[PDB]
Amino acid sequence: RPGQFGDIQSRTPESEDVYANTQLVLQRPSAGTVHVPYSQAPSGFKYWL
Amino acid sequence: QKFQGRVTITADESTTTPYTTTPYTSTAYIELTSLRSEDTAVYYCARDLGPLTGYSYSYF
Amino acid sequence: PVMCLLANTTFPCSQPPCTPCCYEKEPEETLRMLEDNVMRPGYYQLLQASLTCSPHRQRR
């Protein structure tokens, strides 16, 4: 689950079988700017540390 | 010192909001007053980096 | 029009008390009006003519 330990998971330190549930949402750009804005829960690992 | 009090140089406020992600523009005007034949010339506006380059004197 | 105070004499507020080059001639005389015209509406007309309008030469 997002923003908690194990928000991203991987069966081994070399597997490509990534599971992730960061609840990433893309948001509408603004003011004639070219960029991509978004919202996601910050890394649940960085929090757990 | 030759042109002060002969001349008025002035400009129009371009935008007061903390924006312009649009292309920037600025507009200037010059008035010459009490004209004599010897004031005849071609006149150029030119861009100057003097203030941006640490308030140095100009190069155009 | 409207009328300035000089010391006893009066003059129209757009017009000078003394010219040409009002302050540049006589600083300690140009004191006389700026003592007491502070309450009057004409002060910024008198000040423009005396000290700023066209750097004491031609036209704005």
Side-chain angles (χ1 to χ4, degrees), chain A residues 18-42:
Chain A
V18 182
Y19 167 94
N21 181 17
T22 63
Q23 74 133 102
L24 172 63
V25 169
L26 289 161
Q27 292 187 348
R28 192 175 182 278
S30 62
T33 315
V34 285
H35 80 331
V36 180
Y38 62 91
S39 165
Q40 71 185 342

Side-chain angles (χ1 to χ4, degrees), chain C residues 16-31:
Chain C
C18 176
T19 20
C21 305
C22 318
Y23 168 87
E24 314 194 323
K25 289 285 189 175
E26 53 184 23
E28 308 95 319
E29 299 288 352
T30 307
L31 169 66

Side-chain angles (χ1 to χ4, degrees), chain C residues 2 10 12-13 21 24 29-30 32 34 37 39 50 53 60:
Chain C
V2 51
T10 64
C13 298
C21 305
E24 314 194 323
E29 299 288 352
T30 307
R32 264 68 170 181
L34 277 40
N37 284 249
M39 289 293 177
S50 306
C53 193
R60 174 158 284 220

Side-chain angles (χ1 to χ4, degrees), chain B residues 10-15 20 22-29 45-48 52:
Chain B
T10 192
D12 186 32
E13 293 95 328
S14 182
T15 280
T20 310
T22 45
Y24 183 57
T25 67
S26 55
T27 303
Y29 303 81
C45 58
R47 191 175 82 163
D48 175 14
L52 293 173

Side-chain angles (χ1 to χ4, degrees), chain B residues 1-23:
Chain B
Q1 77 274 26
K2 303 200 300 176
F3 297 87
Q4 67 189 1
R6 285 293 314 283
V7 171
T8 291
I9 300 168
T10 192
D12 186 32
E13 293 95 328
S14 182
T15 280
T16 57
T17 48
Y19 180 59
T20 310
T21 300
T22 45

